[PDB]
Amino acid sequence: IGQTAVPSVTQKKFLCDRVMWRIPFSSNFMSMGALTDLGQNMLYANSAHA
Amino acid sequence: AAAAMTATRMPSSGSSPSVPSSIIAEEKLLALLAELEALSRQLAALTQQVSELREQQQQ
């Protein structure tokens, strides 16, 4: 700061402590119901995926 | 590759008011144009009475 301020790099970061990350298995990432739409999507049902 | 990578890394704007003082105004203006005529009238009246010396000395 001031008239003699030194040339400077700007650094950016975040914290998100008590959380646990989530990725809903739903076609549009919304909680439309507990049994999701993709969980009913009977392509990826009976003919089982790795 | 690692260690530091956890965080992240013109011409003319043409101002005008600068570092001078404040300013004020008032509306009681302008007798002054009369004296320019006062001065040049009375100046003639000087010469007019210099002439009145000469025009009496010449008699």
Side-chain angles (χ1 to χ4, degrees):
Chain A
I1 64 167
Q3 287 83 0
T4 61
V6 165
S8 56
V9 164
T10 289
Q11 306 192 309
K12 294 187 178 172
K13 73 182 182 169
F14 75 89
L15 285 171
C16 190
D17 286 334
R18 288 173 162 155
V19 167
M20 174 168 56
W21 297 131
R22 311 207 293 226
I23 298 180
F25 182 62
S26 180
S27 67
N28 76 345
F29 309 112
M30 299 179 81
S31 56
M32 298 183 215
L35 178 62
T36 71
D37 57 348
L38 288 182
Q40 297 174 85
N41 275 247
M42 203 151 289
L43 174 284
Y44 153 57
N46 321 305
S47 52
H49 305 290
Chain B
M5 315 301 292
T6 67
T8 314
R9 93 78 189 68
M10 151 63 65
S12 155
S13 60
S15 172
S16 319
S18 301
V19 204
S21 309
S22 188
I23 295 101
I24 46 163
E26 51 185 14
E27 297 282 353
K28 274 281 182 60
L29 310 188
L30 254 62
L32 298 172
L33 301 184
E35 282 80 356
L36 282 152
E37 210 191 53
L39 293 167
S40 56
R41 279 169 160 205
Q42 289 170 338
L43 182 284
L46 318 184
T47 69
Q48 209 68 357
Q49 289 159 98
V50 177
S51 93
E52 292 274 62
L53 304 181
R54 294 177 55 81
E55 292 187 22
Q56 292 185 37
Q57 290 305 298
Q58 287 158 199
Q59 304 190 22

